[PDB]
Amino acid sequence: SVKSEYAEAAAVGQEAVAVFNTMKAAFQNGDKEAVAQYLARLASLYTRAEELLNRILEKARREGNKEAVTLMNEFTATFQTGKSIFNAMVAAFKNGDDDSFESYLQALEKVTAKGETLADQIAKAL
Numbered sequence: 001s002v003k004s005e006y007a008e009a010a011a012v013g014q015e016a017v018a019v020f021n022t023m024k025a026a027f028q029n030g031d032k033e034a035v036a037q038y039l040a041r042l043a044s045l046y047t048r049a050e051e052l053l054n055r056i057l058e059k060a061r062r063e064g065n066k067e068a069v070t071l072m073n074e075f076t077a078t079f080q081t082g083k084s085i086f087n088a089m090v091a092a093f094k095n096g097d098d099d100s101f102e103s104y105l106q107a108l109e110k111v112t113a114k115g116e117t118l119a120d121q122i123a124k125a126l
Contacts, residue, residue, distance in 0.1 A: 002059050002068075002126045009052035010119060016045040017112070024105060027098075039090055046083055053079060060126065068125040075118050082111045 023038035053076055060068040085108045092100040 002056060002063070003123065005052065005056055005059075006123055006126050009049055009056060010123075012045060012049045012052060013119075016042055016049065019045065020108075020112075027101065027105065035093060039093060042086065043090065046086060050076075050079065050083070056126075065126070068122065071118060071122045071125055075115065075122060078111065078115050078118070082108055082115070085111060 019038050019041050023035055023042065026034035026038060053072070057069065057072040057076060060072055085104050089101055089104040089108065092098075092104060
């Protein structure tokens with residue numbers, strides 16, 4: 001079902017949350033060796049989630065589920081905000097800019113925590 005696919009994409013999302021929190025602890029400890037690996041893992045997770053969310057949106061459209069389309073449009077636009085912030089973090093790590101890294105990390109956390117309200121309504125609309 002579109003709903004089973006949504007639950008799968010939500011689980012990938014929660015996987016990225018878990019890796020993000022481990023990455024934050026490593027950043028705070030100064031384990032540059034670990035942060036680089038977590039960043040690569042997160043990028044692969046975000047790429048997968050984006051693909052899954054897009055397939056779900058296109059299926060909702062083909063089903064004529066207007067309400068799910070609206071919510072998925074709003075959700076994917078916010079997903080892109082987080083992805084822009086994540087890309088900025090990746091660049092800041094590569095430049096050695098821990099100050100910017102922390103700032104972007106904090107921003108990505110609240111773009112993520114504020115997207116929580118919408119993920120719940122998407123499940124119910126699909």
